[PDB]
Amino acid sequence: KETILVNLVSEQTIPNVQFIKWYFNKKQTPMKILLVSTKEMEQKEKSLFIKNALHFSDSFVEWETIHTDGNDISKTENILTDYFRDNEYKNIIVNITGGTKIMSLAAFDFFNNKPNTEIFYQPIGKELQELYPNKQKYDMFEVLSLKEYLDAHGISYKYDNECVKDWNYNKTVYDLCVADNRELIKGMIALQNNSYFNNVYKRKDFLDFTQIEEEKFIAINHPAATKENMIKILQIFGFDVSRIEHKHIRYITGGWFEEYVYQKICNEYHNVDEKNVALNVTIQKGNDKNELDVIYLDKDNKLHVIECKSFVDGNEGNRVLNDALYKLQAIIKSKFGLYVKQHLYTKSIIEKETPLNRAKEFGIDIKDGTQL
Amino acid sequence: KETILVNLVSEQTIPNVQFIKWYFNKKQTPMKILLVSTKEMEQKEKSLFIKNALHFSDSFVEWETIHTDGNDISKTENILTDYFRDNEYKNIIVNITGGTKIMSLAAFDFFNNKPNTEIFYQPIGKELQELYPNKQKYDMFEVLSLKEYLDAHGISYKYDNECVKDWNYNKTVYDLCVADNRELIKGMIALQNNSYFNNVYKRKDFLDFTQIEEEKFIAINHPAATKENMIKILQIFGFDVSRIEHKHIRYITGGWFEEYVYQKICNEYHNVDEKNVALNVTIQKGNDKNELDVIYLDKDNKLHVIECKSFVDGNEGNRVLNDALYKLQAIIKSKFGLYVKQHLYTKSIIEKETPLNRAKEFGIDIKDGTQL
RNA sequence: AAAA
Ligand SMILES: [Mn+2]
Ligand SMILES: [Mn+2]
């Protein structure tokens, strides 16, 4: 353990996780990691998130998290001298991006003009630069996987990338099946949310719509949700009426748009790696679960969350869109750090001032039907 | 001007606005304020927001905003030296709280151990400490008004703390009129959202409920909303049925709870000054306006936003509570700064696990019916 | 407390 990595622990874990893995990628030496943290951050389990994201091996690296006062500059510098008494280390690498300005400046005054030390700073959205001894800039490109990102936030997640239909079908599914049958799709939405149908698919995996009683379809109490209309729209999308699973119904009522968005990202977006894209994702931190439609990590390590609303047209759509904007911004601002971009994708045309102004102030990128 | 105040401009304007007004309050000298900013912040109008909150006499203080690279440490140092060559200033005061770490440590190294300079740092939520020349701590208590807080964020707002009823009435309004008439209030809620009733109040200020025909009351299509039931509940609250205003209906359908929360804060809360309490305020930044029920600034200068939901009972209530939590978190995390506490007040008893877990993860303090 |  002849190389030590000194990092300051604060709310944003990415600057530390990104930096540490990068040094691991360039210099594959075994190291000891010194995380300078505080009582406040250790209560939020921040240094632990740093460990689990990189999930090194006990042999390869040693982690030590030491405590200091985040606001006493002289205490942070004094704790550093006591630790580096008659130092045996051959390479001292210091990343002053984390912590408070007090914590960073305190560590900086101790390590500046030190004989065996490299000092780095990571400006957000820019390439990592070292400040001492030589002023240099390094590219932080493709350094992090998606799993490493969410692990740094203490997030557990599951996803299902299985699509009911393939990319070639999803490129034309709107023009061929959706546009001319939106009233029939509204009937299936009523079917999907009907008390009986939602509970029977808890009991059976497939369902034969031909052998379903007719009374069950009228109990839905929606004009479009007739037995003939529902069987017809199932056939329009190319499903086997004898073997209908809940996944197929979810596809018709808008699940197609999520798969269209998901596959478009995997196949057309070149600044994102296909392996870092997830569909129908569910996150959990502190036993709080949220479902995000499509999330991905681009080559620049910025996280992108997309809320997919197939159609939000009509005035009852503006009520749905405003809730989607609030829901999206609430989730992303609380669960994720500062390096995220919010998106709302829709096939309907958003031409009303209030959602557009709300989105611009929230920072939510909208990709309208005009841009799809 | 013989005193200069150097501040770094960044996302958070409160630490600069707080500090500058404090030094003005302590020394009362005419001074020049040098705002060290960047291209990125001047696009967000940050230095403009800072000046505006203070609004000092043009004669008594002069502002100069100079630009730098937030990530170039040597460039920020050079702009400082060129500016202070043969400086005429007797007192140079430096507040390194703003800006990036690069900007902060650069400003620190330029002024550290230089004569006629005081260096300050403002840790969030603690007393302001100066680091040079003498280590000292100062109290930032009752330093900021509510108006100064919202002005520092570029927010336009209007409010009238006018209540339909007074504190003496709003204490006990629940026990005397609301608790035993919850079904009658639901009819009035249905009445408030009826197309006819909401539109006539667009044209007329008073309404005579005695000459409204019953056919208008059954068009509401709510079991409780009979003409006698609505006349009954209006008189229970003490309103004149011959001339009922929109304020009176809005009061019954939960507006009473906003006034109760507002007045309780003004009369019972020990850490907040009544002049820093606002009711039914509507904010606007960019071109997006939202309405907040009760917001106030406590004597510690932390802003408190309250979402008042009178009742969230039943399955139809959880959807309102779930939406209120997203909406609250979305606004305060996007429109306000780092030093805010979010609250949701309700008369109902919240025991459901998921909303409590959501609120705790969002950081939303909930005060249910247990704590009136 | 990657621009309290
Ligand atoms: Mn969806
Ligand atoms: Mn409300």
mmCIF file with all atom_site columns, C-alpha atoms in Angstrom, chain A residues 179-305:
data_model
loop_
_atom_site.group_PDB
_atom_site.id
_atom_site.type_symbol
_atom_site.label_atom_id
_atom_site.label_alt_id
_atom_site.label_comp_id
_atom_site.label_asym_id
_atom_site.label_entity_id
_atom_site.label_seq_id
_atom_site.pdbx_PDB_ins_code
_atom_site.Cartn_x
_atom_site.Cartn_y
_atom_site.Cartn_z
_atom_site.occupancy
_atom_site.B_iso_or_equiv
_atom_site.pdbx_formal_charge
_atom_site.auth_seq_id
_atom_site.auth_comp_id
_atom_site.auth_asym_id
_atom_site.auth_atom_id
_atom_site.pdbx_PDB_model_num
ATOM 1   C CA . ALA A 1 179 ? -52.963 6.977   -34.748 1.00 0.00 ? 179 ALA A CA 1
ATOM 2   C CA . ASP A 1 180 ? -56.184 5.562   -36.208 1.00 0.00 ? 180 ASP A CA 1
ATOM 3   C CA . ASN A 1 181 ? -57.309 3.663   -33.098 1.00 0.00 ? 181 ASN A CA 1
ATOM 4   C CA . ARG A 1 182 ? -56.899 6.074   -30.187 1.00 0.00 ? 182 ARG A CA 1
ATOM 5   C CA . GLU A 1 183 ? -60.553 5.647   -29.229 1.00 0.00 ? 183 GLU A CA 1
ATOM 6   C CA . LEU A 1 184 ? -60.067 1.859   -29.180 1.00 0.00 ? 184 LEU A CA 1
ATOM 7   C CA . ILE A 1 185 ? -56.924 2.317   -27.078 1.00 0.00 ? 185 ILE A CA 1
ATOM 8   C CA . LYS A 1 186 ? -58.904 4.441   -24.608 1.00 0.00 ? 186 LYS A CA 1
ATOM 9   C CA . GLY A 1 187 ? -61.188 1.451   -24.140 1.00 0.00 ? 187 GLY A CA 1
ATOM 10  C CA . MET A 1 188 ? -58.248 -0.796  -23.288 1.00 0.00 ? 188 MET A CA 1
ATOM 11  C CA . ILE A 1 189 ? -56.945 1.782   -20.808 1.00 0.00 ? 189 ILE A CA 1
ATOM 12  C CA . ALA A 1 190 ? -60.335 1.448   -19.117 1.00 0.00 ? 190 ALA A CA 1
ATOM 13  C CA . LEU A 1 191 ? -59.893 -2.323  -19.302 1.00 0.00 ? 191 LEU A CA 1
ATOM 14  C CA . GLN A 1 192 ? -56.395 -2.190  -17.799 1.00 0.00 ? 192 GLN A CA 1
ATOM 15  C CA . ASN A 1 193 ? -57.677 -0.131  -14.837 1.00 0.00 ? 193 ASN A CA 1
ATOM 16  C CA . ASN A 1 194 ? -60.827 -2.194  -14.344 1.00 0.00 ? 194 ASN A CA 1
ATOM 17  C CA . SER A 1 195 ? -61.039 -3.900  -10.962 1.00 0.00 ? 195 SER A CA 1
ATOM 18  C CA . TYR A 1 196 ? -61.733 -7.363  -12.406 1.00 0.00 ? 196 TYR A CA 1
ATOM 19  C CA . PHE A 1 197 ? -59.043 -7.473  -15.088 1.00 0.00 ? 197 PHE A CA 1
ATOM 20  C CA . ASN A 1 198 ? -56.288 -6.108  -12.868 1.00 0.00 ? 198 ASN A CA 1
ATOM 21  C CA . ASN A 1 199 ? -56.975 -8.807  -10.263 1.00 0.00 ? 199 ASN A CA 1
ATOM 22  C CA . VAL A 1 200 ? -57.324 -11.795 -12.602 1.00 0.00 ? 200 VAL A CA 1
ATOM 23  C CA . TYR A 1 201 ? -53.847 -11.164 -14.056 1.00 0.00 ? 201 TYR A CA 1
ATOM 24  C CA . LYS A 1 202 ? -52.571 -11.512 -10.501 1.00 0.00 ? 202 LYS A CA 1
ATOM 25  C CA . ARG A 1 203 ? -54.020 -15.038 -10.698 1.00 0.00 ? 203 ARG A CA 1
ATOM 26  C CA . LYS A 1 204 ? -53.149 -16.092 -14.279 1.00 0.00 ? 204 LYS A CA 1
ATOM 27  C CA . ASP A 1 205 ? -50.264 -15.358 -16.651 1.00 0.00 ? 205 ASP A CA 1
ATOM 28  C CA . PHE A 1 206 ? -52.182 -15.571 -19.938 1.00 0.00 ? 206 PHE A CA 1
ATOM 29  C CA . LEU A 1 207 ? -55.824 -14.891 -20.673 1.00 0.00 ? 207 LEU A CA 1
ATOM 30  C CA . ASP A 1 208 ? -58.065 -16.046 -23.540 1.00 0.00 ? 208 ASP A CA 1
ATOM 31  C CA . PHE A 1 209 ? -60.152 -13.059 -24.589 1.00 0.00 ? 209 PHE A CA 1
ATOM 32  C CA . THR A 1 210 ? -62.428 -15.199 -26.749 1.00 0.00 ? 210 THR A CA 1
ATOM 33  C CA . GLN A 1 211 ? -63.542 -17.277 -23.764 1.00 0.00 ? 211 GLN A CA 1
ATOM 34  C CA . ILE A 1 212 ? -64.067 -14.253 -21.490 1.00 0.00 ? 212 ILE A CA 1
ATOM 35  C CA . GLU A 1 213 ? -67.695 -13.648 -20.575 1.00 0.00 ? 213 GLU A CA 1
ATOM 36  C CA . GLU A 1 214 ? -69.238 -10.690 -22.346 1.00 0.00 ? 214 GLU A CA 1
ATOM 37  C CA . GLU A 1 215 ? -70.658 -9.324  -19.074 1.00 0.00 ? 215 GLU A CA 1
ATOM 38  C CA . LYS A 1 216 ? -67.122 -8.694  -17.782 1.00 0.00 ? 216 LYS A CA 1
ATOM 39  C CA . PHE A 1 217 ? -66.424 -6.299  -20.671 1.00 0.00 ? 217 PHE A CA 1
ATOM 40  C CA . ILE A 1 218 ? -69.573 -4.218  -20.183 1.00 0.00 ? 218 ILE A CA 1
ATOM 41  C CA . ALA A 1 219 ? -68.883 -4.010  -16.436 1.00 0.00 ? 219 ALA A CA 1
ATOM 42  C CA . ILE A 1 220 ? -65.880 -1.897  -17.440 1.00 0.00 ? 220 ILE A CA 1
ATOM 43  C CA . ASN A 1 221 ? -68.514 0.755   -18.266 1.00 0.00 ? 221 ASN A CA 1
ATOM 44  C CA . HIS A 1 222 ? -66.560 2.444   -21.054 1.00 0.00 ? 222 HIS A CA 1
ATOM 45  C CA . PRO A 1 223 ? -68.130 2.875   -24.523 1.00 0.00 ? 223 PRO A CA 1
ATOM 46  C CA . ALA A 1 224 ? -65.050 1.629   -26.371 1.00 0.00 ? 224 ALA A CA 1
ATOM 47  C CA . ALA A 1 225 ? -64.441 -1.314  -24.004 1.00 0.00 ? 225 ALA A CA 1
ATOM 48  C CA . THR A 1 226 ? -66.661 -3.806  -25.793 1.00 0.00 ? 226 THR A CA 1
ATOM 49  C CA . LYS A 1 227 ? -65.565 -7.401  -26.262 1.00 0.00 ? 227 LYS A CA 1
ATOM 50  C CA . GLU A 1 228 ? -65.351 -6.976  -30.039 1.00 0.00 ? 228 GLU A CA 1
ATOM 51  C CA . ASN A 1 229 ? -63.446 -3.683  -29.833 1.00 0.00 ? 229 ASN A CA 1
ATOM 52  C CA . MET A 1 230 ? -60.888 -5.074  -27.394 1.00 0.00 ? 230 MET A CA 1
ATOM 53  C CA . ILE A 1 231 ? -60.335 -8.269  -29.393 1.00 0.00 ? 231 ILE A CA 1
ATOM 54  C CA . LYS A 1 232 ? -60.058 -6.159  -32.550 1.00 0.00 ? 232 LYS A CA 1
ATOM 55  C CA . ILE A 1 233 ? -57.402 -3.822  -31.150 1.00 0.00 ? 233 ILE A CA 1
ATOM 56  C CA . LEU A 1 234 ? -55.492 -6.814  -29.783 1.00 0.00 ? 234 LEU A CA 1
ATOM 57  C CA . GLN A 1 235 ? -55.408 -8.208  -33.335 1.00 0.00 ? 235 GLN A CA 1
ATOM 58  C CA . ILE A 1 236 ? -54.409 -4.821  -34.791 1.00 0.00 ? 236 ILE A CA 1
ATOM 59  C CA . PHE A 1 237 ? -51.180 -4.916  -32.780 1.00 0.00 ? 237 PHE A CA 1
ATOM 60  C CA . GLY A 1 238 ? -50.625 -8.538  -33.774 1.00 0.00 ? 238 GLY A CA 1
ATOM 61  C CA . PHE A 1 239 ? -51.294 -10.350 -30.501 1.00 0.00 ? 239 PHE A CA 1
ATOM 62  C CA . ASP A 1 240 ? -52.644 -13.876 -30.044 1.00 0.00 ? 240 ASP A CA 1
ATOM 63  C CA . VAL A 1 241 ? -56.155 -13.406 -28.663 1.00 0.00 ? 241 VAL A CA 1
ATOM 64  C CA . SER A 1 242 ? -56.019 -16.898 -27.149 1.00 0.00 ? 242 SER A CA 1
ATOM 65  C CA . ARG A 1 243 ? -52.845 -16.106 -25.133 1.00 0.00 ? 243 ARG A CA 1
ATOM 66  C CA . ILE A 1 244 ? -52.961 -12.509 -23.865 1.00 0.00 ? 244 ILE A CA 1
ATOM 67  C CA . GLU A 1 245 ? -50.548 -11.562 -21.081 1.00 0.00 ? 245 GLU A CA 1
ATOM 68  C CA . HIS A 1 246 ? -50.549 -8.378  -19.005 1.00 0.00 ? 246 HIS A CA 1
ATOM 69  C CA . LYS A 1 247 ? -47.396 -7.242  -20.822 1.00 0.00 ? 247 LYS A CA 1
ATOM 70  C CA . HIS A 1 248 ? -49.327 -7.071  -24.101 1.00 0.00 ? 248 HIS A CA 1
ATOM 71  C CA . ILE A 1 249 ? -52.082 -4.895  -22.613 1.00 0.00 ? 249 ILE A CA 1
ATOM 72  C CA . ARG A 1 250 ? -49.496 -2.556  -21.052 1.00 0.00 ? 250 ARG A CA 1
ATOM 73  C CA . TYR A 1 251 ? -47.907 -2.244  -24.502 1.00 0.00 ? 251 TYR A CA 1
ATOM 74  C CA . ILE A 1 252 ? -51.104 -1.000  -26.145 1.00 0.00 ? 252 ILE A CA 1
ATOM 75  C CA . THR A 1 253 ? -51.961 1.557   -23.449 1.00 0.00 ? 253 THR A CA 1
ATOM 76  C CA . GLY A 1 254 ? -48.677 3.442   -23.960 1.00 0.00 ? 254 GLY A CA 1
ATOM 77  C CA . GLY A 1 255 ? -45.999 0.846   -23.183 1.00 0.00 ? 255 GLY A CA 1
ATOM 78  C CA . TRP A 1 256 ? -45.117 0.982   -26.882 1.00 0.00 ? 256 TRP A CA 1
ATOM 79  C CA . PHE A 1 257 ? -43.907 4.564   -26.527 1.00 0.00 ? 257 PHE A CA 1
ATOM 80  C CA . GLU A 1 258 ? -41.472 3.601   -23.756 1.00 0.00 ? 258 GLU A CA 1
ATOM 81  C CA . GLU A 1 259 ? -40.016 0.825   -25.909 1.00 0.00 ? 259 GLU A CA 1
ATOM 82  C CA . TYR A 1 260 ? -39.840 3.211   -28.872 1.00 0.00 ? 260 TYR A CA 1
ATOM 83  C CA . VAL A 1 261 ? -37.939 5.734   -26.747 1.00 0.00 ? 261 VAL A CA 1
ATOM 84  C CA . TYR A 1 262 ? -35.748 3.028   -25.195 1.00 0.00 ? 262 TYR A CA 1
ATOM 85  C CA . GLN A 1 263 ? -34.738 1.424   -28.497 1.00 0.00 ? 263 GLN A CA 1
ATOM 86  C CA . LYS A 1 264 ? -34.249 4.799   -30.195 1.00 0.00 ? 264 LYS A CA 1
ATOM 87  C CA . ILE A 1 265 ? -31.718 5.652   -27.489 1.00 0.00 ? 265 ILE A CA 1
ATOM 88  C CA . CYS A 1 266 ? -29.917 2.314   -27.798 1.00 0.00 ? 266 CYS A CA 1
ATOM 89  C CA . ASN A 1 267 ? -29.785 2.494   -31.594 1.00 0.00 ? 267 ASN A CA 1
ATOM 90  C CA . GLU A 1 268 ? -29.624 6.193   -32.561 1.00 0.00 ? 268 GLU A CA 1
ATOM 91  C CA . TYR A 1 269 ? -28.057 8.180   -29.702 1.00 0.00 ? 269 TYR A CA 1
ATOM 92  C CA . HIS A 1 270 ? -24.266 8.071   -30.148 1.00 0.00 ? 270 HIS A CA 1
ATOM 93  C CA . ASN A 1 271 ? -23.209 9.910   -26.983 1.00 0.00 ? 271 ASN A CA 1
ATOM 94  C CA . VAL A 1 272 ? -24.756 7.169   -24.814 1.00 0.00 ? 272 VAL A CA 1
ATOM 95  C CA . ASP A 1 273 ? -23.573 3.581   -24.460 1.00 0.00 ? 273 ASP A CA 1
ATOM 96  C CA . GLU A 1 274 ? -26.256 0.955   -25.125 1.00 0.00 ? 274 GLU A CA 1
ATOM 97  C CA . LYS A 1 275 ? -25.219 -0.972  -21.984 1.00 0.00 ? 275 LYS A CA 1
ATOM 98  C CA . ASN A 1 276 ? -26.008 2.045   -19.774 1.00 0.00 ? 276 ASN A CA 1
ATOM 99  C CA . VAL A 1 277 ? -29.688 2.332   -20.812 1.00 0.00 ? 277 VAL A CA 1
ATOM 100 C CA . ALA A 1 278 ? -32.467 0.833   -18.677 1.00 0.00 ? 278 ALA A CA 1
ATOM 101 C CA . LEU A 1 279 ? -36.218 0.535   -19.239 1.00 0.00 ? 279 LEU A CA 1
ATOM 102 C CA . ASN A 1 280 ? -39.071 0.286   -16.718 1.00 0.00 ? 280 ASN A CA 1
ATOM 103 C CA . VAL A 1 281 ? -36.637 1.029   -13.901 1.00 0.00 ? 281 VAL A CA 1
ATOM 104 C CA . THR A 1 282 ? -37.558 1.137   -10.215 1.00 0.00 ? 282 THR A CA 1
ATOM 105 C CA . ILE A 1 283 ? -35.305 2.892   -7.716  1.00 0.00 ? 283 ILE A CA 1
ATOM 106 C CA . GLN A 1 284 ? -35.353 2.614   -3.932  1.00 0.00 ? 284 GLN A CA 1
ATOM 107 C CA . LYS A 1 285 ? -33.544 4.580   -1.239  1.00 0.00 ? 285 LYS A CA 1
ATOM 108 C CA . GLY A 1 286 ? -34.743 4.587   2.356   1.00 0.00 ? 286 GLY A CA 1
ATOM 109 C CA . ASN A 1 287 ? -37.580 2.173   1.486   1.00 0.00 ? 287 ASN A CA 1
ATOM 110 C CA . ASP A 1 288 ? -39.000 4.805   -0.891  1.00 0.00 ? 288 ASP A CA 1
ATOM 111 C CA . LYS A 1 289 ? -39.709 3.473   -4.389  1.00 0.00 ? 289 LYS A CA 1
ATOM 112 C CA . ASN A 1 290 ? -40.147 5.487   -7.581  1.00 0.00 ? 290 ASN A CA 1
ATOM 113 C CA . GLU A 1 291 ? -40.536 4.219   -11.139 1.00 0.00 ? 291 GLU A CA 1
ATOM 114 C CA . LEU A 1 292 ? -38.686 5.982   -13.943 1.00 0.00 ? 292 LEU A CA 1
ATOM 115 C CA . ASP A 1 293 ? -39.621 5.082   -17.497 1.00 0.00 ? 293 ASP A CA 1
ATOM 116 C CA . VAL A 1 294 ? -36.221 5.382   -19.215 1.00 0.00 ? 294 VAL A CA 1
ATOM 117 C CA . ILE A 1 295 ? -32.919 6.331   -17.583 1.00 0.00 ? 295 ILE A CA 1
ATOM 118 C CA . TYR A 1 296 ? -29.466 6.227   -19.139 1.00 0.00 ? 296 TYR A CA 1
ATOM 119 C CA . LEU A 1 297 ? -25.900 7.377   -18.509 1.00 0.00 ? 297 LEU A CA 1
ATOM 120 C CA . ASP A 1 298 ? -24.208 9.121   -21.421 1.00 0.00 ? 298 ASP A CA 1
ATOM 121 C CA . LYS A 1 299 ? -20.536 8.866   -22.331 1.00 0.00 ? 299 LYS A CA 1
ATOM 122 C CA . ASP A 1 300 ? -19.897 12.090  -20.361 1.00 0.00 ? 300 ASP A CA 1
ATOM 123 C CA . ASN A 1 301 ? -21.168 10.416  -17.131 1.00 0.00 ? 301 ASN A CA 1
ATOM 124 C CA . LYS A 1 302 ? -24.237 12.678  -16.938 1.00 0.00 ? 302 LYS A CA 1
ATOM 125 C CA . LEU A 1 303 ? -27.406 10.865  -15.885 1.00 0.00 ? 303 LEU A CA 1
ATOM 126 C CA . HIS A 1 304 ? -30.527 11.303  -18.015 1.00 0.00 ? 304 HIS A CA 1
ATOM 127 C CA . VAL A 1 305 ? -34.010 10.493  -16.735 1.00 0.00 ? 305 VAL A CA 1
#
